[PDB]
Amino acid sequence: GSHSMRYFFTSVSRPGRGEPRFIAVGYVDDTQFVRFDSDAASQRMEPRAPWIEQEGPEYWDGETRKVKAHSQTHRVDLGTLRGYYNQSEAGSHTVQRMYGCDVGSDWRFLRGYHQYAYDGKDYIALKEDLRSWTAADMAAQTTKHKWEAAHVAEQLRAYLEGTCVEWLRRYLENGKETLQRTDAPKTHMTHHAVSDHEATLRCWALSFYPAEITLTWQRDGEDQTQDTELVETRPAGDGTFQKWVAVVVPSGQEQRYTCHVQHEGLPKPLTLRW
């Protein structure tokens, strides 16, 4: 199947005194592997997955230096953006950056991305061709002109097609025992009665990896969406994921309803009944 490496960065200004809170996290697919927190004692990029510890002291020195550069750009950014938007010094503001690369089943480059937000809103993003920019407003258009003069897209494209792809390939090999393994959802169903005429059926999927999954109800073999509740896919905390979907049914008619699970760890779609 396909794979990705993605980095996420949040900086939140602290008006009264000092520099912003900066948090960086790195992912391969749904596995977090590195972190940096400016409020932490070490002031180093830290491992969050056993397989990244394979990497030597040069790696960690290099990543630390780069993540600190990221942090300084963000600090500069908060001040510039405050200027662009004519805002006071009194309020706390936020910048968010995400970037990374996708590869298909053959592990070849599929797409790359680099997007940026200010106070939760689209600011500027690299386009799919990795050659041009999407600026949301006139502040972002000023940045686009600046990044065009300086050929920023060209530098990002090289990373996204090269290093990004090359180091994801490297990470997938080193962590193959977990990263290249699929864990099938463990499924069951529960029953509840609200009154002597109405019942709830809940279909559970547990302990699955990767996070992507589809859970749906059918009634007499037709898709049923009305009277269903589908929760957001949630982390178990051991690296696996969980999700459920529920349907409300007339008591006694439970047998008409089937739950259907699709997941990349299941060669065939699974079906459950009460």
């Binding site: 780069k66 550069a69 662009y84």
Partner: peptide, 9 residues
């Protein structure tokens, strides 16, 4: 492996 450089806005 992080991008070598990050341009400011």
């Amino acid at each position: 492996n992080l991008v070598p450089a990050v341009a400011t806005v």
